[PDB]
Design a protein around this nucleic acid. Structure first.
Ligand SMILES: [Mg+2]
Ligand SMILES: [Mg+2]
Ligand SMILES: [Mg+2]
Ligand SMILES: [Mg+2]
Ligand SMILES: [Mg+2]
Ligand SMILES: [Mg+2]
Ligand SMILES: [Mg+2]
Ligand SMILES: [Mg+2]
Ligand SMILES: [Mg+2]
Ligand SMILES: [Mg+2]
Ligand SMILES: [Mg+2]
Ligand SMILES: [Mg+2]
Lengths: 200, 115, 134, 122, 90, 128
RNA sequence: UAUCAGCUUGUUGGUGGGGUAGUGGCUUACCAAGGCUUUGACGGGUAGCCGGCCUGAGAGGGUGACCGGCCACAUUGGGAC
RNA sequence: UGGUUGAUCGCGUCGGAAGUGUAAUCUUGGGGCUUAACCCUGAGCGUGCUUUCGAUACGGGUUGACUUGAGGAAGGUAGGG
């Protein structure tokens, strides 16, 4: 119920950097496997499916839960892709990643599932915990000196925190100013393509 | 030219050339191009981003394309509707449609200035 | 024999508009005169007139003069009969039809006389959906 | 038709032909192999397709295909019969579920094993 | 004088119809017609039902338009009573 | 006899009762003549909402409460208004009150010791 | 379902009695000849009904598990206490 | 199924009001289970029905006109009917 295999293979297949940089993605222009350099047809399904899989492997969400997110966004009022990206960003592991306390979303999932975090006073070990507005995520007092935590404390200045979060790095406290908007989620997929895909 | 009231069709239409009937309806923003392959390609090239298109009649690609084409040609832009009726857009056309046109135009203004 | 004089009016108007005739004429009835009046007030025809019989000397004649814009352009994009004699259509104040996404007008006969949908909705009154002229 | 015609006599749908009557509303049915043999396919095509006349527990006797390279079932072998048509075989509308009851999984399978009842090999 | 909750309110069912059988004693079969939409095609149909009323004195004849009021079961099939005759077509 | 009793609802190991009015013969979780209140005992200082006017009407018309409903009416004070008895009538204590906006505004500004204990944990990694 | 067209004689109505918690051919005596039906009676087939469930843009189509309401039944048939 | 029109009824039709449409489900707003499923709670829905008060354009009922549809009279008239 969690993808544990290599991520560079998925990034190469999907054609975009799922996470990180300056890595084995120097072989980017071609998917993994023996048949990587051949010319591709890329149907509309192919395109749509690529966008959906890009979002899925970026956020570490499997198909059933991603589908559930899709119906929630579709029911919600407003743009379906905007709401879907808003939900995926409101996931707690992504919140930790965006605040910059984790090197990657996989590391954020690791620490969240291991329970190194407090949500507004209550301990949460659910990576899919949907953080609500005005929430206060806190690092567990016992685990305020994790090696990944201190690496993040050394590196966060380079990292860019989105406008909808406030982070007290050394304190391990992520204040949620508001639930993010499409202009605030970084554009790296085609949510419109995903929405069109979930209609066929 | 195709009249778009803010990234979507102005009003529902039904076009038909030979035997290729294509139905088009406007959709709320974010709905996407819910259309079959040929009609969807026609709409995506025309620039419509929120539309519901159904293909009635024959499924031949050429005829379906012509039906989508004359369905779009049947579109009647609100200002020219007002000219037709000898009235004003505020007197003939829905306030929600006109408003959505203003927000589309202004968001367009934002994008242009940002360039 | 004649069954729906309202449908006869609508088809006469449609055929004349298609053939680019400037005027069309028909036997007069009160409901036909009302529909012609609201068509004129909504701008789908140039004008209308009820004439006392002088050729057949039998009954009043309703005559509609149509309008074509610059470069001979139709002012009527179509007209359709809804409440047929075979099957009659009645709409409530909440389920009032929308024509051409609101650009066209449905003609509804309400208890307060002939009223275009927009009007009816404002008065929260329904009735018989006569036509969908757009 | 006119509205009055529709009122007097309404629309009637089609019959919606059934495909596997012998199963009698069951996903698969148990049967006994009353005959095991081979049949030539229709044309085009050419082979020795392995089939069996089976008396299913519904009391109906039908011809069932035996998929996979390999075959052990014989006279009076208890089998499970599921739906499934063999296109180049007139009169065959059922297949025998490998790996269930007397019939056993295809010997040298390593791909699509579950469809032929082959247990995973260490 | 001071009777109990008067009015009784509780009013009974009333039907206007046409007499189609008067040839049994103290009984008239009334045909009552109602107009309803067709459930699927929306046309306004005409639904007709035969109601047996109780006509004391046999005051109504064939083709008479009558008014009946529902009552308690007066026989195996009679459940209505004649209250007036509206048109005596004769 | 007409009873005022509890109709069980909710999950396994999480009961929420509806104080309802129905006759004795009816099954426990069935159609009720009227729903009067609710009773959540799983929650802190159990929630007890009872419609005073309706419960007074049903007591005065002769509905017989179950012992549980008698306890709830004692706590709501209805069992004293009807069948006047000297009982404490301990109207439910509230199950306290949290808040979110005030805490967020308190911490947004908290700043100071937020990043301050934060550089103290910097000294901690030093100690780490 | 018309490749089922006639069905019914306590049957339809009336009066008196009886009976019942109660109206009533519910029952009885007498009198009358009605009652239902091509807008489908009678017969055959299938079926517990519904709140709902699934699907569907909707209209509809399929369905009647859990849960809830009504009904029917308790080895088969009948009967009362 | 219904040409033109006067009057009237207010059955269809339309608009209010009251009653009803249990609960659960369902839609939606809040709340609780570490999240979710799930659960609680407010509202909507419950597409109808009954009662009642209005409106009268249209459909229909009742009733009276009109002649243009339809039929008839008189005269004219063609034809392997
Ligand atoms: Mg065609
Ligand atoms: Mg008697
Ligand atoms: Mg059965
Ligand atoms: Mg059913
Ligand atoms: Mg049950
Ligand atoms: Mg008429
Ligand atoms: Mg009139
Ligand atoms: Mg609820
Ligand atoms: Mg919660
Ligand atoms: Mg309900
Ligand atoms: Mg009339
Ligand atoms: Mg002659």
């Amino acid at each position: 119920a969690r993808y544990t295999g290599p991520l560079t293979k998925k990034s190469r297949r999907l054609g975009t950097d799922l996470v990180g940089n300056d890595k084995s993605f120097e072989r980017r222009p071609y998917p993994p496997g023996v048949h990587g350099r051949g010319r591709t047809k890329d149907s509309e399904y192919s395109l749509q499916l690529r966008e959906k899989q890009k979002a899925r492997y970026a956020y570490g969400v499997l198909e059933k839960q991603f589908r559930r997110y899709y119906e929630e966004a579709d029911r919600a009022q407003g743009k379906t892709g905007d709401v879907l990206l808003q939900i995926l960003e409101s996931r707690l592991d992504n919140v930790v990643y965006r605040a910059g306390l984790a090197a990657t979303r996989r590391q954020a999932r690791q620490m969240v599932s291991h329970g190194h975090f407090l949500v507004n006073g209550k301990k949460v070990n659910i990576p899919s915990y949907r953080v609500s507005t005005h929430d206060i995520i806190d690092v567990r007092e016992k685990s305020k000196d994790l090696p990944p935590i201190v690496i993040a404390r050394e590196t966060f200045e380079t990292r860019d925190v989105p406008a909808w979060l406030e982070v007290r790095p050394n304190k391990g406290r992520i204040l949620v100013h508001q639930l993010p908007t499409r202009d605030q989620i970084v554009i790296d997929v085609n949510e419109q393509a995903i929405v069109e895909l979930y209609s066929k | 030219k195709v009249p778009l009231v803010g990234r979507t069709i102005t009003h529902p239409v039904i076009g038909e050339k030979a035997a290729g009937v294509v139905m088009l309806r406007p959709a709320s923003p974010g709905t996407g191009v819910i259309a079959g392959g040929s009609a969807r390609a026609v709409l995506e090239c025309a620039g419509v981003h929120d539309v519901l298109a159904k293909s009635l009649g024959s499924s031949n690609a050429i005829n379906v394309v012509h039906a989508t084409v004359d369905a779009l040609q049947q579109l009647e832009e609100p200002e020219e509707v007002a000219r037709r009726r000898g009235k004003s857009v505020e007197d003939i056309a829905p306030a929600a449609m006109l408003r959505a046109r203003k927000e589309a135009d202004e968001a367009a203004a934002a994008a242009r200035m940002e360039e | 024999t004649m069954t729906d004089p309202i449908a006869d009016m609508l088809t006469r108007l449609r055929n004349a508009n298609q053939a680019y005739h400037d005027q069309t004429s028909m036997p007069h009835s009160k409901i036909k005169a009302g529909i012609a009046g609201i068509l004129k007030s909504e701008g789908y025809i140039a004008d209308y007139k009820v004439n006392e019989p002088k050729e057949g000397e039998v009954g009043k004649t309703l005559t509609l003069t149509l309008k074509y814009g610059e470069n001979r352009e139709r002012s009527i994009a179509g007209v359709r009969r809804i409440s047929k004699p075979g099957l009659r259509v009645y709409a409530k104040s909440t389920a009032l039809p929308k024509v051409l996404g609101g650009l066209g007008i449905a003609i509804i006969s309400t208890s307060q006389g002939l009223l275009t949908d927009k009007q009816a909705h404002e008065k929260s009154v329904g009735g018989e959906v006569l036509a969908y002229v757009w | 038709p006119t509205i009055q015609q529709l009122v007097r006599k309404g629309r009637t749908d089609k019959i919606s032909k059934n495909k596997t009557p012998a199963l009698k509303g069951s996903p698969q049915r148990r049967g006994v192999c009353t005959r095991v043999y081979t049949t030539t396919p229709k044309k085009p095509n050419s082979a020795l397709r392995k089939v069996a006349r089976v008396r299913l527990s519904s009391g109906i006797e039908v011809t069932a295909y035996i998929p996979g390279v390999g075959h052990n079932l014989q006279e009076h072998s208890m089998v499970l019969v599921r739906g499934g048509r063999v296109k180049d075989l007139p009169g065959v509308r059922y297949k025998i579920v490998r790996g269930s009851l007397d019939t056993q999984g295809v010997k040298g399978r390593k791909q699509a094993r579950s469809r032929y009842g082959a247990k995973k090999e260490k | 004088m001071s009777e109990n909750t008067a009015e009784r309110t509780t009013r009974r069912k009333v039907r206007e119809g046409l007499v189609v059988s008067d040839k049994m004693n103290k009984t008239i079969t009334v045909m009552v017609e109602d107009r309803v939409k067709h459930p699927l095609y929306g046309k306004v149909m005409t639904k007709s039902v035969r109601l047996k009323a109780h006509d004391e004195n046999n005051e109504a004849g064939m083709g008479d338009r009558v008014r009946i009021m529902e009552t308690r079961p007066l026989s195996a099939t009679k459940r209505w009573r004649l209250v007036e005759i509206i048109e005596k077509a004769k | 006899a007409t009873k005022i009793r509890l109709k069980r609802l909710g999950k396994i190991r999480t009961p929420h009762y509806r104080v309802v009015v129905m006759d004795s013969r009816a099954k426990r979780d069935g159609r009720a003549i009227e729903e009067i209140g609710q009773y959540h005992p799983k929650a802190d200082p159990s929630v007890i909402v009872i419609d005073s006017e309706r419960v007074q009407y049903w007591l005065g018309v002769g509905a017989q409460p179950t012992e549980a409903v008698v306890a709830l009416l004692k706590r709501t004070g209805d069992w004293q208004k009807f069948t006047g008895d000297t009982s404490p009538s301990g109207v439910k204590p509230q199950p306290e009150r949290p808040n979110k906006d005030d805490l967020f505004n308190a911490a947004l500004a908290e700043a100071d010791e937020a990043p301050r204990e934060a550089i103290t944990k910097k000294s901690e990694g030093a100690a780490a």
